[PDB]
């Protein structure tokens, strides 16, 4: 609630631009998210908290162009990929939702890559990527896998983020469906 109210509210006023305001916001409610934790009350209370801030930020920073909010998705995306391990499962709504979500966060790097942040962008999406993965999907991922495996198939980029260059190339391997696997191991 203060989690949820303070997040959707202050984060909402932030839709006129936030800068430090949002980020620390993202920090405190995000960071003081888990350090304040209890089974029952706080565990599943979060489960809805996390749940509906998912539904939020997909919208929120999806809209948000880059600006402050490249750094807002520093704060978040870090808190995201680390909040994967929070729920190994009960992911399914947020499995798929975050699936094409962070897909489009690759896309948000695709708007503007590089600088300092967009590194942090795709990088944080990468650990966002796998510990997420239970298998449990087929072409919800595989679809993504395809032209991820294009998006990294190419694209001279910084020395730093180059993990993505290879990032999903075997992660698509953990996606068992053949013919894309064919595509890659031919290509790779």
């Amino acid at each position: 609630c203060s989690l949820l109210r303070l997040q959707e509210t202050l984060s909402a006023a932030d839709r006129c631009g936030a800068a430090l305001a949002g980020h620390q916001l993202i920090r405190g409610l995000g960071q003081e998210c888990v350090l304040s934790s209890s089974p029952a009350v706080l565990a599943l209370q979060t489960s809805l908290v996390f749940s509906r801030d998912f539904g939020l930020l997909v919208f929120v920073r999806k809209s948000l162009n880059s600006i402050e909010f490249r750094e807002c998705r520093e704060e978040i995306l870090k808190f995201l990929c680390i909040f994967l391990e929070k729920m190994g499962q009960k992911i399914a709504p947020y499995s798929v939702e975050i699936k094409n979500t962070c897909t489009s966060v690759y896309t948000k790097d695709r708007a503007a890559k590089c600088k300092i942040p967009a590194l942090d962008l795709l990088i944080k999406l990468l650990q966002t990527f796998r510990s997420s993965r239970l298998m449990d999907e087929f072409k919800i991922g595989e679809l993504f896998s395809k032209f991820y495996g294009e998006l990294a198939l190419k694209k001279k980029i910084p020395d730093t983020v180059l993990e993505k260059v290879y990032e999903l190339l075997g992660l698509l391997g953990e996606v068992h469906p053949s013919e894309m696997i064919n595509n890659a191991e031919n290509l790779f």
Partner: protein
């Protein structure tokens, strides 16, 4: 790093008024001054940020929530409709409407204003250095009534200068250009001159460009056994624009176009693997790796080597090509080339001798033979530096340099000419300068962009002479070129 520069207009009352004078309110003159530097940083395109604020007035624009202020804009590198947004403010209709619509003049209090604009130095979120501010006032008397305001001037003033933050008052014509000397110090805050006006500002920055830059730092091993690291510097690059940027049509927005290689036969892709770097001639196509190419450069490494000592006068121009930009040998990191490099230049210049090097550009190259003249160190009383101590980075001449140039006979002149020719040139000569020299015909386009910047009719359409002025040509010298013309010839041109 990308710094602060600040416009401000004083207000007591009559300032936005014209003093009932029949030209302009010097307030407005200031207006176009603001225009001029903010616009100026279109051209110069300076990551320095600019300030537009007034005070001393009826209503307010601020966050400090006090009487007699207005913000105009927060610190910025400019904007086109930041320009336009401010462009309302010329003209008596815009004088007034600007005034009243914002409200114009009641009272003020001085150092209050200080930390006003200073507290626009609050506005810094980024890396700036220069704290530089300008007040626009004819005010002869800040006040006589409360000299506690005066103590406040002499009080917070020293703070704000001590803040490293610097405002002065240029000589903006209160009568005499000002008649006041008297108490004025507080109001205000490599050998040059100073000016009282904007015109200097205007033209001076019409073509102007970047200032603080030194980046990629190489080395010179002198021998194998001893060290210097060499600062690479551009006196200029033959400065050019930031070049045409991709923005799509109605969307107006950056394309974020990308490029890679599809297969150009089959609908597939292509990869740097899948290709290579070739030379082809005649029958034989020959293909060798982009790597193989890029390391075929390899001889040593980026870095430099004293290769010897040569008469400076040995080569003046039999020759010339792509310039030295100026490497200053670094001495902080590696000093003693403080001393070493010092006496080096001392005596090598004394010898009229120079240090040849083989320069190896960045991420290797094939390196090249280039002389280094020792560059002398020129400073006057206030230290005009024409010759920052260093080296002339002197490309050597090579085959390509001489790849071709003709030779044949030459038929020669007579002193009968030179008797006149000399003074003729004395009429054709000018003492020249360091300054007002460019290729404006490119400047004219960031004029053409000054257009959309102001969104107006015709550019500044300013004046440099890169083209000769006929009245002087036919004036000082005259037609004596006739004498020359019929000297040896009835030309018919």
């Amino acid at each position: 790093g990308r710094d602060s520069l600040i416009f401000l207009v004083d207000a007591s009352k009559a300032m936005f008024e014209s003093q009932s004078e029949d030209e302009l309110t010097p307030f407005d003159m200031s207006i176009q001054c603001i225009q001029s530097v903010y616009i100026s940083k279109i051209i110069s395109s300076d990551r320095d940020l600019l300030a537009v604020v007034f005070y001393g007035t009826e209503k307010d624009k601020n966050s400090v929530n006090f009487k007699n202020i207005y913000v105009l804009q927060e610190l910025d590198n400019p904007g086109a409709k930041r320009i336009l947004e401010l462009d309302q403010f010329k003209g008596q209709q815009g004088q007034k409407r600007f005034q009243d619509m914002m409200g114009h003049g009641s009272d003020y209090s001085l150092s209050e204003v200080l930390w006003v604009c200073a507290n626009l130095f609050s506005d810094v979120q980024f890396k700036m250095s220069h704290k530089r501010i300008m007040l626009f006032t004819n005010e002869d008397n800040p006040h006589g009534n409360d000299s506690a305001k005066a103590s406040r001037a002499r009080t917070k003033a020293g703070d704000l200068r001590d803040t490293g933050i610097f405002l002065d008052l240029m000589h903006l014509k209160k009568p005499g250009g000002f008649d006041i000397s008297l108490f004025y110090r507080d109001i205000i805050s490599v050998h040059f001159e100073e000016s009282s006006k904007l015109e200097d500002l205007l033209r001076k920055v019409r073509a102007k460009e970047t200032r603080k830059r030194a980046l990629s730092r190489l080395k010179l091993k002198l021998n194998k056994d001893i060290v210097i690291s060499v600062g690479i510097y551009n006196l200029v690059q033959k400065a050019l624009k930031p070049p045409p940027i991709k923005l799509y049509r109605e969307t107006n927005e950056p394309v974020k176009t990308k490029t890679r290689t599809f297969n150009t036969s089959t609908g597939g892709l292509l990869l740097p693997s899948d290709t290579k770097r070739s030379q082809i001639y005649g029958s034989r196509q020959i293909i060798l790796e982009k790597e193989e190419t890029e390391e075929l450069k390899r001889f040593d490494d980026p870095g430099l080597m004293l290769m010897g000592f040569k008469p400076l006068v040995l080569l003046k121009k039999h020759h010339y090509l792509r310039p030295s930009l100026f490497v200053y040998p670094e001495e902080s990191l590696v000093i003693g080339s403080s001393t070493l490099f010092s006496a080096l230049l001392i005596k090598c210049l004394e010898k009229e001798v120079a240090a040849l090097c083989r320069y190896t550009p960045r991420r290797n190259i094939p390196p090249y033979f280039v002389a280094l003249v020792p560059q002398e160190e020129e400073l006057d009383d206030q230290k005009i530096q024409v010759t920052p101590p260093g080296f002339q980075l002197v490309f050597l001449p090579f085959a390509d340099d001489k790849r071709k140039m003709p030779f044949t006979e030459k038929i020669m002149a007579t002193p009968e000419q030179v008797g006149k020719m000399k003074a003729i040139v004395e009429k054709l000569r000018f003492t020249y300068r360091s300054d007002s020299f460019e290729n404006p015909v490119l400047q004219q386009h960031f004029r053409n962009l000054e257009a959309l910047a102001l969104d107006l009719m015709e550019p500044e359409q300013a004046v440099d002479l890169t083209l000769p002025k006929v009245e002087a040509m036919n004036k000082r010298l005259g037609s004596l070129v006739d004498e020359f013309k019929e000297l040896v010839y009835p030309p018919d041109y």
